[PDB]
Coordinates of C-alpha atoms and ligand atoms in Angstrom, one line a residue:
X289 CA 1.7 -0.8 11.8
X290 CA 3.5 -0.1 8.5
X291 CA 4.0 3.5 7.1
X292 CA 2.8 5.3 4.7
X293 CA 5.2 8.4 4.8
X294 CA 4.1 11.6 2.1
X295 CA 6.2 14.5 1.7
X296 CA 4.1 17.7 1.0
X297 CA 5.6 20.3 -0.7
X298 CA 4.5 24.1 0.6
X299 CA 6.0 25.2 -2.7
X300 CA 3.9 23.2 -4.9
X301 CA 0.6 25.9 -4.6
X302 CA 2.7 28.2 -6.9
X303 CA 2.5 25.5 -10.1
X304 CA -0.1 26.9 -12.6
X305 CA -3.1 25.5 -13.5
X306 CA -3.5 21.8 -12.8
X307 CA -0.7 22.1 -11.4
X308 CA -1.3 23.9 -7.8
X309 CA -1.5 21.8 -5.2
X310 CA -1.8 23.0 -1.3
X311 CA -2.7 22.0 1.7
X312 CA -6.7 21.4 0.6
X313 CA -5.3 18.4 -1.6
X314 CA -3.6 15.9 0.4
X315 CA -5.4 13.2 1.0
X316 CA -4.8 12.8 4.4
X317 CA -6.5 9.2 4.6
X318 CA -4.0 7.7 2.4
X319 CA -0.8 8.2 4.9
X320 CA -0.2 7.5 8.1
X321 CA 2.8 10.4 8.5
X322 CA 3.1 13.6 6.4
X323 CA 5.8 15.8 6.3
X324 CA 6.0 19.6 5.5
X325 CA 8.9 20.5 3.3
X326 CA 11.0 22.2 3.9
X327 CA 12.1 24.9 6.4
X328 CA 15.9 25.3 6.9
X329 CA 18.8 27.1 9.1
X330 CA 19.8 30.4 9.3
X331 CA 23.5 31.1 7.9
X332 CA 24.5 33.7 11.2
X333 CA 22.7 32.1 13.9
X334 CA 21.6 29.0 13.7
X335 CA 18.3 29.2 14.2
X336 CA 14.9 27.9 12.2
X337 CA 15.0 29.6 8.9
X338 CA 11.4 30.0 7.5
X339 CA 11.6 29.8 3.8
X340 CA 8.3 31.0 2.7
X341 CA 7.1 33.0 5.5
X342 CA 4.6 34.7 3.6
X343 CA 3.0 31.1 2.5
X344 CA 4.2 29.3 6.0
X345 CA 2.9 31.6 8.2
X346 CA 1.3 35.0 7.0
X347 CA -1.0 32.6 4.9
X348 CA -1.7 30.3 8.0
X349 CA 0.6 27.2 5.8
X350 CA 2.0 25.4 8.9
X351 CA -1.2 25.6 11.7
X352 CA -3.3 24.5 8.3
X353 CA -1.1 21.6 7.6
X354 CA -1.3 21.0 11.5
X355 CA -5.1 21.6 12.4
X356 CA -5.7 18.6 9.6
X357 CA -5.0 16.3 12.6
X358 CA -8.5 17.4 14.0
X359 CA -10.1 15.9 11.3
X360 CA -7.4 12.5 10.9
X361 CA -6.3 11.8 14.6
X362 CA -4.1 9.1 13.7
X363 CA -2.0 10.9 11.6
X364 CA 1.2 12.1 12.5
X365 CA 2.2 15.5 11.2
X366 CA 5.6 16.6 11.1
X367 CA 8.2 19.0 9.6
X368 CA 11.2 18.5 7.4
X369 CA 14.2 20.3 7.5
X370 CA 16.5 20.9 4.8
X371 CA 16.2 19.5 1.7
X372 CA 18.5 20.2 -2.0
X373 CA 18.0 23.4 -2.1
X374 CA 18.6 24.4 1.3
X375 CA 22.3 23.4 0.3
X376 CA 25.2 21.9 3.2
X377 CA 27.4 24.1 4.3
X378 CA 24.9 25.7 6.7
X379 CA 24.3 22.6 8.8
X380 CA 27.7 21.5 8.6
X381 CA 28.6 24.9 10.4
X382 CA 26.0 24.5 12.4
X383 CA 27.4 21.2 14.0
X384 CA 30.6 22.4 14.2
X385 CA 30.6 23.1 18.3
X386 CA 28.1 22.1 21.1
X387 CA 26.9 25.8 21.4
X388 CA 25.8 26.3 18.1
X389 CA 23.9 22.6 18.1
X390 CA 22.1 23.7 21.2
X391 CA 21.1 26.8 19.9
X392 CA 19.7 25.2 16.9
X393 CA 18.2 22.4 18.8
X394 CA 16.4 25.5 21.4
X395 CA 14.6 27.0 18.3
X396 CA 13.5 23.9 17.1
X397 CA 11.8 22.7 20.0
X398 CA 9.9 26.5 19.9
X399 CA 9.4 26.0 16.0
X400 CA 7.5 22.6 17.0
X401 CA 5.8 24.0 19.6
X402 CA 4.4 27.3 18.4
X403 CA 2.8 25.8 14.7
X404 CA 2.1 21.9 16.7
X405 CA 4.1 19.8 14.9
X406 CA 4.3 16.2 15.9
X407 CA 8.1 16.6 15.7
X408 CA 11.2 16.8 12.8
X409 CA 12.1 15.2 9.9
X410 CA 16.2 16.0 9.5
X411 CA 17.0 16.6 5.4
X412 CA 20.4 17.8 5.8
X413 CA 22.0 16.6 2.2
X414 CA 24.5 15.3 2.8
X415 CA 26.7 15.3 6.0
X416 CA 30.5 14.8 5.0
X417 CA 29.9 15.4 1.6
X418 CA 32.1 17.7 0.1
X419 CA 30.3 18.8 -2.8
X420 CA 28.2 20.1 -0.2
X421 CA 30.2 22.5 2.0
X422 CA 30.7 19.3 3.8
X423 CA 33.7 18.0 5.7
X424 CA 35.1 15.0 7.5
X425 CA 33.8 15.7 11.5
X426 CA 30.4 15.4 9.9
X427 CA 29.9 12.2 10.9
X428 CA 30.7 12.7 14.7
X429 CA 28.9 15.9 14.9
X430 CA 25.3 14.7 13.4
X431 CA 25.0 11.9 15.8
X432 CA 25.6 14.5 18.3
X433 CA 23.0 16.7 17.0
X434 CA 20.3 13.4 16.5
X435 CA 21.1 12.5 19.8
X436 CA 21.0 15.7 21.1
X437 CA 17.5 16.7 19.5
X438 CA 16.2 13.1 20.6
X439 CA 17.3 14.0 24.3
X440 CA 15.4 17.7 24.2
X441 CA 12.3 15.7 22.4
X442 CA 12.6 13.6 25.6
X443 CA 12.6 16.5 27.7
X444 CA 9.3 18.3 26.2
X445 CA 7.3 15.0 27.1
X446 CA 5.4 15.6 24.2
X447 CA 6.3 12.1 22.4
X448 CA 7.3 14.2 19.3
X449 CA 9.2 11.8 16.5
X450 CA 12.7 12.3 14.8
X451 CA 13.4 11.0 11.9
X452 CA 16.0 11.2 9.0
X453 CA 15.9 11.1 5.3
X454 CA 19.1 9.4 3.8
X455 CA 21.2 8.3 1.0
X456 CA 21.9 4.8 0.0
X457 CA 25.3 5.1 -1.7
X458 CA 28.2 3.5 0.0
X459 CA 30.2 6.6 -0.2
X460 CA 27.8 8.4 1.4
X461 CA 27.0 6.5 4.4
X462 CA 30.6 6.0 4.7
X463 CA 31.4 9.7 5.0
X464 CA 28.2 10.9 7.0
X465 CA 26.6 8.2 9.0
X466 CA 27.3 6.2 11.9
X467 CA 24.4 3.6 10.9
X468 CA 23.6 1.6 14.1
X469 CA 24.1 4.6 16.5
X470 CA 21.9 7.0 14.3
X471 CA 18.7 4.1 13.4
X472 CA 18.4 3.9 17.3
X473 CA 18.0 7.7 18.0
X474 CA 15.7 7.7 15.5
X475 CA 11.8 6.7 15.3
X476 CA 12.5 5.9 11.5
X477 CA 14.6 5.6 8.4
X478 CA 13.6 7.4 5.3
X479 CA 16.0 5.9 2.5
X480 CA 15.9 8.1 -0.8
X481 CA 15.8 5.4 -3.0
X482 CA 15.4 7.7 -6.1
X483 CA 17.5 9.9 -7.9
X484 CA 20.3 7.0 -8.3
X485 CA 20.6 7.8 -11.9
X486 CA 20.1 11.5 -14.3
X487 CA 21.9 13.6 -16.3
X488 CA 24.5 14.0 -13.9
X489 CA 25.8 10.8 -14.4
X490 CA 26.0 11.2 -18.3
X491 CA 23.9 8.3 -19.9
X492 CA 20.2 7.6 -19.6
X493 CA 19.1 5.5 -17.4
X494 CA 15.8 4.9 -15.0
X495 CA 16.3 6.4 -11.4
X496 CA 15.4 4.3 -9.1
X497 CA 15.9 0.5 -10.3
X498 CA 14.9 -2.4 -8.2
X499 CA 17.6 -4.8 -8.8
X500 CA 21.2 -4.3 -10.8
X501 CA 21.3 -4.5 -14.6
X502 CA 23.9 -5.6 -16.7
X503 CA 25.4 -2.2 -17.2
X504 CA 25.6 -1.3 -13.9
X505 CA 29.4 -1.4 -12.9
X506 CA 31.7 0.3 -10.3
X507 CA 30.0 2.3 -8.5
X508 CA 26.6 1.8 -9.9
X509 CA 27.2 -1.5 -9.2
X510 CA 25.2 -1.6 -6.0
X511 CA 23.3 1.7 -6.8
X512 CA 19.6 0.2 -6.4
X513 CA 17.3 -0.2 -4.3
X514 CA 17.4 -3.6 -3.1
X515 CA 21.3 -3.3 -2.7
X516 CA 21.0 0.1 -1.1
X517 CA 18.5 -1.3 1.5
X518 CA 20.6 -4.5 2.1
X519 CA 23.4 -1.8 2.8
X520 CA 21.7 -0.3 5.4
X521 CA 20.8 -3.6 7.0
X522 CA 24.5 -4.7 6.8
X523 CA 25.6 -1.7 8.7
X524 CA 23.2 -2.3 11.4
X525 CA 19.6 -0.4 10.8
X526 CA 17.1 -2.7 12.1
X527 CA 14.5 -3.9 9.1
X528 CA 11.5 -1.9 11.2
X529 CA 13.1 1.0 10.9
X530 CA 13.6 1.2 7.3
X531 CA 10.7 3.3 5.1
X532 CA 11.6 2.6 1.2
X533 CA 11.3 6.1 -0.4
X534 CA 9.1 5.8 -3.9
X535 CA 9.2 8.8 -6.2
X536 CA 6.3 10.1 -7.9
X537 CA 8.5 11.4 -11.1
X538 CA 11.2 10.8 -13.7
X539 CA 14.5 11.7 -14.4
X540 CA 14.4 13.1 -17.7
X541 CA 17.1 13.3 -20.6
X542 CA 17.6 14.9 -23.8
X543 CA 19.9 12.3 -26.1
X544 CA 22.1 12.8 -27.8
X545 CA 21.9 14.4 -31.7
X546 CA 21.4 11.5 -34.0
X547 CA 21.4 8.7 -31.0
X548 CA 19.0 6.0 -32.3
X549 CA 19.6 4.0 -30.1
X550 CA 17.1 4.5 -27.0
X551 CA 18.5 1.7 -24.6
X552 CA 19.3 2.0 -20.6
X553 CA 22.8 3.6 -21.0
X554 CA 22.5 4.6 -24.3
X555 CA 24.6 7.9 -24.8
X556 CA 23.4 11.8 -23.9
X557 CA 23.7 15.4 -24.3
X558 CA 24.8 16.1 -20.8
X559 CA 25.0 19.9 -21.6
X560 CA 21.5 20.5 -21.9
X561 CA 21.0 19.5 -18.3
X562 CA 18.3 16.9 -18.8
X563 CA 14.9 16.7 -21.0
X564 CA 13.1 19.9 -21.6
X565 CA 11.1 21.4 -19.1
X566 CA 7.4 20.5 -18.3
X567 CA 4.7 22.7 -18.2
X568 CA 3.8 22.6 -14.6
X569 CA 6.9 21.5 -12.5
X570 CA 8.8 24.0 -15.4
X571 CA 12.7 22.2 -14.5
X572 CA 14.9 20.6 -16.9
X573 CA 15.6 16.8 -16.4
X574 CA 12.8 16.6 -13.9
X575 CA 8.5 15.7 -14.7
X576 CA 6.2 15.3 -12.2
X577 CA 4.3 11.4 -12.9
X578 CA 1.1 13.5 -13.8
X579 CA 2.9 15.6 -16.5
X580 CA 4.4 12.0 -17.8
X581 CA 1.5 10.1 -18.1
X582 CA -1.0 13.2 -20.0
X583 CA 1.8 12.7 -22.3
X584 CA 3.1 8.7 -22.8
X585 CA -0.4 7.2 -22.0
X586 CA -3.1 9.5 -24.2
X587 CA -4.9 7.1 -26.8
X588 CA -3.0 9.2 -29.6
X589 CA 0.8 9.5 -27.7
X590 CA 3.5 9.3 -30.0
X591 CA 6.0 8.4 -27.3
X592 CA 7.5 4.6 -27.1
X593 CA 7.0 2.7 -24.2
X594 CA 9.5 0.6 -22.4
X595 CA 9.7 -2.2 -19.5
X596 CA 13.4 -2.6 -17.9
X597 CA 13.3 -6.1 -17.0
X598 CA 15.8 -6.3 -14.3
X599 CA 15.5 -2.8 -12.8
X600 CA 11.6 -3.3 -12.9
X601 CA 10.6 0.5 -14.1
X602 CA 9.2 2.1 -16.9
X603 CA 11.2 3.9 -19.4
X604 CA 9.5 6.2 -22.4
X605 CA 11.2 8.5 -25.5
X606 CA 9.7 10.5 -28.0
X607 CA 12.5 12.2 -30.7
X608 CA 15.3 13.3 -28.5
X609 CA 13.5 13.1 -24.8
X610 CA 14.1 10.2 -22.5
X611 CA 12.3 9.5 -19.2
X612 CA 12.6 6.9 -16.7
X613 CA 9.8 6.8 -13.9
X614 CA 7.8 4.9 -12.5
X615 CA 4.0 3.6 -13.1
X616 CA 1.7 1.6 -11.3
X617 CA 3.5 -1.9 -12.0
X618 CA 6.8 -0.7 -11.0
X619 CA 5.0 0.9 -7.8
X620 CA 3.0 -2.8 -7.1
X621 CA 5.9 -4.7 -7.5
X622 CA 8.1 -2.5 -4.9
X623 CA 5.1 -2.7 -2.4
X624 CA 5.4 -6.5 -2.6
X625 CA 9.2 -6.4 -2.6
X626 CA 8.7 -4.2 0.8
X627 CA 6.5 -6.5 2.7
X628 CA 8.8 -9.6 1.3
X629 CA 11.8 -7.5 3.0
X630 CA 9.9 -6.7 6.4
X631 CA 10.8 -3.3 6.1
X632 CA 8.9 -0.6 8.0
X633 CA 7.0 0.3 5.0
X634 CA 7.4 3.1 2.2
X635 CA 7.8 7.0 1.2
X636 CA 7.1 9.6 -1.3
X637 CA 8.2 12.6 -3.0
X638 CA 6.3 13.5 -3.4
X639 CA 2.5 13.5 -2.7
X640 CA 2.0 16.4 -4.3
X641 CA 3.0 14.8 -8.0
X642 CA 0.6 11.8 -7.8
X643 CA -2.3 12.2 -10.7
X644 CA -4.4 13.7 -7.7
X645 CA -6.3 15.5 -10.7
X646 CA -6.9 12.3 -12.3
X647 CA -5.8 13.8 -15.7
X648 CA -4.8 10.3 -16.6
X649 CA -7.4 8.1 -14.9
X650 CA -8.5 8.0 -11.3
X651 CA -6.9 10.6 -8.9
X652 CA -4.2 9.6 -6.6
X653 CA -3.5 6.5 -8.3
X654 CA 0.3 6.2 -7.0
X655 CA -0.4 6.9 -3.5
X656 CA -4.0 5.0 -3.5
X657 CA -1.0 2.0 -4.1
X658 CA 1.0 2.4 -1.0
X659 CA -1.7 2.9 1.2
X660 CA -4.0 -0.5 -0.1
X661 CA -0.5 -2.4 0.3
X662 CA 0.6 -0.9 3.6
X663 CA -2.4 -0.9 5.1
X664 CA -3.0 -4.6 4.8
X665 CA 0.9 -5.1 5.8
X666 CA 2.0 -6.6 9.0
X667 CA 5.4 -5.0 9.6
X668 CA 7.2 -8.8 11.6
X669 CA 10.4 -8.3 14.4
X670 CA 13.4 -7.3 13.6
X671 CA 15.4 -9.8 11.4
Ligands
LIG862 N1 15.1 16.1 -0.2 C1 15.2 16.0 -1.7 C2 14.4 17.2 -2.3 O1 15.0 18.4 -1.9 C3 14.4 17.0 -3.8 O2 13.4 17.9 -4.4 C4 13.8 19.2 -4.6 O3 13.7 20.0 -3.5 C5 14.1 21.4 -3.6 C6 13.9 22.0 -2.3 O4 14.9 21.5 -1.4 C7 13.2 22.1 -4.7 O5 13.7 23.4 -4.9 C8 12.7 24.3 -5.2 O6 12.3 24.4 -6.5 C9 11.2 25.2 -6.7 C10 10.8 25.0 -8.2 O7 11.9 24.5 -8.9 C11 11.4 26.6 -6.4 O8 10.2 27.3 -6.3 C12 10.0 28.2 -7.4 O9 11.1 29.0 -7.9 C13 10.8 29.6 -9.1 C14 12.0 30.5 -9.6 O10 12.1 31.6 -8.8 C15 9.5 30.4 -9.2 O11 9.1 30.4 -10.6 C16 8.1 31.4 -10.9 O12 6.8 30.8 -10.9 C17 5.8 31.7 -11.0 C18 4.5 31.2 -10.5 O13 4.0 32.1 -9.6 C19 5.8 32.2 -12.4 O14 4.7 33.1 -12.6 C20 7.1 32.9 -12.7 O15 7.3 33.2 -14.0 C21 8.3 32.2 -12.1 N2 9.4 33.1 -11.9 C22 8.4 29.9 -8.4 O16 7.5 30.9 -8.0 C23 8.9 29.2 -7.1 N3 7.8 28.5 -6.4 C24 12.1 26.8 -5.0 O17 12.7 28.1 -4.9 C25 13.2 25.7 -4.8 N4 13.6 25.7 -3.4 C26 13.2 21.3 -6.0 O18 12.2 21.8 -6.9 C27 13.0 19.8 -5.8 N5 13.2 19.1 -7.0 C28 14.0 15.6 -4.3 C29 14.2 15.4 -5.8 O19 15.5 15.5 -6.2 O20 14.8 14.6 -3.6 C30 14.6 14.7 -2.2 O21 15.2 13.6 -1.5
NAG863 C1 -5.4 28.0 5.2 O1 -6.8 28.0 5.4 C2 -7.5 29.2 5.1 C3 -9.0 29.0 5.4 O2 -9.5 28.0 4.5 C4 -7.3 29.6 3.7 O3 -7.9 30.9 3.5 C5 -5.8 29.7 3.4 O4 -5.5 30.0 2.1 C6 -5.1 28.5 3.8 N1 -3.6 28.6 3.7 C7 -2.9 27.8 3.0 C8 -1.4 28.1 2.8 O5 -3.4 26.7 2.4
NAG864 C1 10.6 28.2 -16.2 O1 12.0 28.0 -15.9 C2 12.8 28.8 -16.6 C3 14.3 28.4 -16.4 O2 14.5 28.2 -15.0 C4 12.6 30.3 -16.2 O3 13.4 31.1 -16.9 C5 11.1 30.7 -16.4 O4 10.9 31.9 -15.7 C6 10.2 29.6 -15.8 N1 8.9 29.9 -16.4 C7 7.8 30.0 -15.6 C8 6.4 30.0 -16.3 O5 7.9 30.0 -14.4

């Protein structure tokens, strides 16, 4: 009864080489909920916004994502909305009045209907945030839209799910999330327990840490993932709700010139946005876990291998690159961590950057992790 929630990427068929992965790939048998990512809003009318429709639709991307459910009944499969790149400001306009919420929440239910989707994963980053065309009556206005959506979900009789991915910084949930009101409209949790440190932030550092380190102060001070969960249990989401998100790739850096010192915290050069691009996932400050281990684990890798003992992830560096990450230890030792907590089990992104080549070893090694932990996992009441 635990979940095993994998976000699918529809753009990750356009990575070369070993790279592509699409629809053909996922395993299926390894979660129990996948999520197509992402569509989005329209600016003018507030209606589904089909990103790739050439991929999505043209190509058949949706109804074969979809149609998998023939061959895995159990599996739920739904569709995200949003995401980083999909920006704010277009969601927070878009429950700015009733009209404009219903009009959204109208071509969803059509969206979900017409490419059967077992309902919506909301990935609006973030509400309230001003750094994302965000503003204060966020907070109001997307409980109104989740119970609004929850209520037309109702109404189709369908049984279709709603669920949310979120933040875990204080700040955050502070200035876009009315916690108890939001985990009971919603069928699950999905905390983004990743990204909580990069180049951003000016010093390297692994991104998603279990436990706090010694350098961790103000307001990094509770910026891991056991505090961040214990947040959202202290501001009232039941522990079955909560799904631990798990990422599949490292926050890259490139230090600073003549840094020798290759510590957690140590010192970067902010201005070249991260470590250098990889060859498949092609971004600054951001590798894929199958482009980080055919490089740190070969039998001839000149890259240096680190354990950080209170965070409990894997660091590595070679020259001036720095990468935090994580590997199958740090993976095993959250699963264990999630079924100590009672939470409602775990998350991806994504499942589309798991070794599912098996470049490095056997395919799907990351994912093959949650699922034999989950799957054996007794999710127990509320605490
Ligand atoms: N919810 C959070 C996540 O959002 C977040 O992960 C991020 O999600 C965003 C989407 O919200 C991702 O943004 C996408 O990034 C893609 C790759 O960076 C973009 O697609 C590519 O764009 C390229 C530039 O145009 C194209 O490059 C071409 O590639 C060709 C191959 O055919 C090549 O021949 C050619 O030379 C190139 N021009 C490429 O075609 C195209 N597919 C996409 O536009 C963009 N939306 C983001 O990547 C991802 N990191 C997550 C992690 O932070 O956290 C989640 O919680
Ligand atoms: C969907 O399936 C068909 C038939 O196998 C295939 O031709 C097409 O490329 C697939 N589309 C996507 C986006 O995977
Ligand atoms: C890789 O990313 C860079 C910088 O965004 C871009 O200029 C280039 O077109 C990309 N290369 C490929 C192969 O897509």
């Amino acid at each position: 009864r635990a979940r095993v929630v994998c976000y699918f990427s529809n753009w990750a068929v356009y990575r070369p080489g070993v790279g592509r992965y699409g629809i053909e790939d996922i395993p299926v048998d390894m979660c129990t909920h996948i999520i197509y990512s992402f569509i989005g809003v329209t600016e003018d009318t507030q209606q589904v916004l089909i990103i790739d429709p050439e991929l999505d639709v043209d190509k058949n991307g949706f109804k074969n994502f979809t149609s998998l459910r023939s061959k895995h009944p159990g599996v739920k499969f739904t569709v995200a909305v949003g995401g980083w790149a999909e920006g704010g400001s277009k969601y927070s306009k878009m429950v700015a009045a009733k009209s404009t919420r219903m009009a959204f929440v109208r071509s969803v239910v059509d969206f979900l209907n017409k490419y059967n989707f077992d309902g919506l994963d909301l990935d609006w980053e973030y509400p309230g945030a001003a750094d994302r065309g965000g503003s204060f009556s966020d907070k109001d206005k997307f409980l109104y839209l989740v119970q609004e959506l929850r209520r037309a979900f109702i109404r189709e009789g369908k049984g279709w799910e709603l669920t949310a991915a979120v933040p875990l910084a204080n700040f955050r949930l502070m200035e876009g999330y009315h916690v108890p009101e939001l985990c009971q409209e919603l069928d699950a949790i999905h905390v983004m327990s990743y990204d909580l440190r990069g180049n951003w932030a000016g010093f390297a550092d692994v991104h998603s840490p279990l436990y706090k380190r010694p350098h961790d102060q103000w307001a990094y001070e509770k910026l891991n993932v056991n505090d961040g969960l214990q947040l959202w249990e202290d501001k009232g989401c039941p522990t079955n709700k909560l799904v631990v998100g798990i990422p599949f790739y490292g926050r890259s850096f490139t230090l600073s010139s003549g840094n020798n010192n290759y510590n957690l915290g140590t010192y970067i050069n902010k201005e070249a946005g991260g470590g250098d691009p990889a060859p498949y996932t092609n971004a600054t400050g951001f590798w894929a876990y199958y482009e980080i281990c055919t490089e740190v684990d070969t039998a001839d890798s000149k890259w240096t291998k680190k354990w950080d003992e209170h965070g409990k992830c894997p660091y590595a560096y070679k020259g001036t690159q720095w990468v935090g990450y994580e590997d199958p230890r740090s993976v095993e030792i959250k699963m264990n961590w999630i079924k100590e907590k009672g939470y409602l089990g775990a998350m991806t992104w994504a499942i589309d950057m798991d070794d599912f080549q098996g470049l490095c070893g056997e395919k799907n090694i990351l994912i093959k992790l949650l699922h034999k932990h989950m799957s054996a996992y007794t999710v127990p009441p509320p605490r």
